[PDB]
Point group: C2
Chain length 397, copies 2
């Protein structure tokens, strides 16, 4: 067996393996406008030619593979290069042999050289990927509210236009949304095609809310079908915009029995309605992994300063993430990341640290459930320095 | 006339309640009681302790409310709590503003009885919010496949199947409530009400005992039709949590699905190996600050702050309106003033109640424009308000 990069030549093979593992629903293949799922996976190929791709070869057959798609994301206000793992798969035959372990090893080595200090991953197998060091970074919420539970109109100064989903104003609002919302993908025109690849864009519309200035501040992607108002999602730069969009939705009362939508961050709708007695479902949506602890931390926008302490980190795959990471802020509250166990220890594994930095859970909770080992004082330090915002992420790959 | 309702008005009360009380046709038989005419008359012992008021169409009871005296844990401190139960108006009489006056009377009586916080099951969320209540806690519901059950974790303790009224169940819950924000401190009477809609005979308590033979965790469950049902689980530490889950997972061969509820906003999924489950999250209970100054002078603030003041709007209680300055003395103890000390924090009673229960954080509430204040004071609010999710599994 040979583990090597996969090339131009091998791309056909890459695709074939990918159909055999791709867990796309039959419903989503129909909605996408692609006849079958081979046509569907052949549209993913422009992603692959951007990515670093590796595989195992039963020479010269491709039997297992991993790709790293280069992205950029918002981590608490800082733009980080991100390694997006896609196209992962082993042929069911070859699953006992720790093939994927080495691909992941390889991929992490590549991500580190590419200065990708954080990696996102859609979870095909949470338990497997958690053992390789990933942790959940974000939730997706789903709700279904009765027409009878729709919110009362809030006075707003602006107006709504119904626009094509690829109107330039949509892109502009998202470019700013991503820059002020933790977790988010910074999108190119190309990430936007991928955003719409399971759906017929022409059967969707963007309700865009314009402030009194005719500047767009909010986007609702929706369609009406069989007396349901369908919300793909909404994103808004402020409360006025949110309220404008909800005003537009509640004006559809006489057209619909229900309103169904998703929210791509753990921020339940229920509280924000006057009738909060709805059921929402909450599911983990994406995972993340710190690739290089030191380099991650030294770019991290810590909220505040602290007495010096240090992380003692265990990483089950990446050698360079084991050991001591000391933090010290100087007079100008500027941080440096040391190798010195200066101050009290905080013992955790790579999963838990990634959870911390993505704020999927807070330090205290993780201490409480015995995933962080340190003392009360340092635990207060963590709570002070780690920002408290819920990750947003809308993309798929 | 509106007047206290007494021993003689007890059946009327129980009728009105049986009428407007939506309980499910399924859950009525489950109690071991036939319909809501021998089942609502087991509810009688709540009321002898409670303060009950009503409206009488002379001399029939047409609108009513009850305040059941309880004690609860708020961020570690014990508070007397006024539990509003059995509220309702007959549909004929429904649009005359009767309940608003019963609520005023209720709130007045809670102030007198020194109940600075009130809990209320949300029958009509929009209505009670307009009267000053807000959501305090969530209930989470899960359904996990046998195939997603957690891997066994080594523990030194042991499990036993006990009856749900074993005294070790009561021991563990008495300790649990003392260390979990939101929780009802249970009287023997609250425990018999816990099991009102349910046949205790057909439920079992699996109790985990640690090495030193002390009970540390309880699981209320039953197996029916190859589903493992979990009423709930409470536990004093993670060792107990694991040993309770070890027991559950041991039943893999017996079931396809594990279904249960969690009476706190702490999702299960994260704590599982296979976290890929959907849980539903729903508002479970409402709370209300009865008296702002009194509540706050007893409140276990996590920290001290540069003095500031709330400016509070309350749509029912006069005495909850206005300014409430906060300053901490040299014993780190707060004193609550009339004086506009420092920067103002504008909010209503619903969102103040939301803060003290920690249903949402200050920065979130500010962000959605339910708190009006500056960046420095917001940072203070975030420092002084403890961060725990409220647990509450009782019903009334």
């Amino acid at each position: 067996l040979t583990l090597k990069p996969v090339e131009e030549e091998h791309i056909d093979q890459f695709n074939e393996l990918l159909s055999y593992v791709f867990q796309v629903t039959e419903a989503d293949i129909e909605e996408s406008g692609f006849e079958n799922k081979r046509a569907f996976i052949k549209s993913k190929q422009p992603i692959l030619e951007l990515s670093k791709v590796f595989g195992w070869f039963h020479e010269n057959q491709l039997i297992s593979q991993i790709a790293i798609y280069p992205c950029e994301v918002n981590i608490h206000g800082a733009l980080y290069k991100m390694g997006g793992v896609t196209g992962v798969g082993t042929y069911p035959e070859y699953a006992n042999h720790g093939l994927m372990k080495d691909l992941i090893q390889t991929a992490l080595e590549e991500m580190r050289q590419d200065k990708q200090w954080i990696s996102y991953l859609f979870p095909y197998n949470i338990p497997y990927y958690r053992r390789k060091g990933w942790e959940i970074m974000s939730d997706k919420l789903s709700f279904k509210i009765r027409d009878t539970q729709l919110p009362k109109t809030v006075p707003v100064p602006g107006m709504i236009e119904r626009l094509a989903v690829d109107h330039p104003d949509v892109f502009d609002v998202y470019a700013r949304f991503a820059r002020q919302n933790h977790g988010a993908l910074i999108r190119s025109a190309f990430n936007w095609e991928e955003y719409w690849r399971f759906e017929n864009e022409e059967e969707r519309t963007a309700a865009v809310y314009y402030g009194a200035n005719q500047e767009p501040l909010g986007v609702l992607f929706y369609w009406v079908a069989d007396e349901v108002f369908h919300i793909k999602e909404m994103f808004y730069l402020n409360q006025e915009a949110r309220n404008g969009l909800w005003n537009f939705i509640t004006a559809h009362f006489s057209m619909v029995y229900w309103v169904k939508g998703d929210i791509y961050k753990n921020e339940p709708l229920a509280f924000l309605l006057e009738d909060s007695q709805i059921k929402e479902s909450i599911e983990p949506y994406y995972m993340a992994r710190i690739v290089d602890v030191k380099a991650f931390l030294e770019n991290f926008p810590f909220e505040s300063t602290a007495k010096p302490f240090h992380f003692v980190v265990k990483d089950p795959v990446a050698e360079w993430n084991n050991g001591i990471f000391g933090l010290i802020w100087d007079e100008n509250d500027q941080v440096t990341i040391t190798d010195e166990p200066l101050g009290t220890a905080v013992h955790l594994d790579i999963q838990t640290l990634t959870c911390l930095v993505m704020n999927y859970r807070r330090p205290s909770y993780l201490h409480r459930i015995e995933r962080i080992d340190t003392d009360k004082e340092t635990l207060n330090s963590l709570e002070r320095i780690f920002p408290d915002q819920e990750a947003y992420f809308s993309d798929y790959f």
